[PDB]
């Protein structure tokens, strides 16, 4: 059917462990540190999208203009494909016109 059969694995999760303990510690970095470095650098994440959060089409546009010459050919053709798709997607057919 569509249910489980027994009670599932017991969710051993310590909500108070170290790798979550400092979650945002030293993360008011800018005005609480005499303006040396903004929070706009403290994020450890991909350089395609580290803090210019536009739309989906914008997301891909930034991915291209940042790292396109660093992809295998499948990713380049893929990013080009969806970029063409989205450029057609924005201004063609929708609810508000």
């Amino acid at each position: 059917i569509g249910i489980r059969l027994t009670l599932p694995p017991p969710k051993v999760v310590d909500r108070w462990n170290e790798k979550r303990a400092m979650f945002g510690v030293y993360d008011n970095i800018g005005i609480l540190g005499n303006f040396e470095k903004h929070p706009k650098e403290l994020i450890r994440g991909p350089i395609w999208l580290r803090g210019w959060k536009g739309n989906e089409l914008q997301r891909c546009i930034r991915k291209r203009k940042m790292v396109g010459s660093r992809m295998f050919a499948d990713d380049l053709h893929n990013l080009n494909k969806r970029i063409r798709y989205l450029y057609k997607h924005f201004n063609r057919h929708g609810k508000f016109r």
Binding site: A21, M22, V25, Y26, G33, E41, L42
Partner: protein, 99 residues
């Protein structure tokens, strides 16, 4: 426990490796080490020869001025010529209208 201490600044201005193939051209050129000097003084920088412009660049700037800056007397003479021409045109138009 207690985390590693928060991010600090970089240890002064660092020149890049000119051998490094990854560096963008924006921070390894002529004015870039100038920006490095403007960051860390002469204290970390180099000899201030980058501060003054080049003699070839000096001749280029002179050419830029010669093709981009007249003298006030020349402008005054052009204004006087334009005013004289405007007065003559106005007098001719008034004479044509009167006749």
């Amino acid at each position: 426990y207690r985390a590693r201490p928060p991010p600090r600044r970089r240890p002064g201005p660092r020149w890049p490796d000119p051998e490094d193939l990854l560096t963008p051209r924006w921070q390894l050129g002529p004015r870039y080490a100038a920006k490095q000097f403007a960051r860390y003084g002469a204290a970390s920088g180099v000899v201030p020869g980058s501060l003054w412009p080049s003699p070839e660049q000096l001749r280029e700037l002179e050419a830029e001025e010669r093709e981009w800056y007249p003298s006030l007397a020349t402008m005054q003479e052009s204004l006087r010529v334009k005013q004289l021409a405007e007065e003559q045109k106005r007098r001719e138009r008034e004479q044509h209208i009167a006749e």
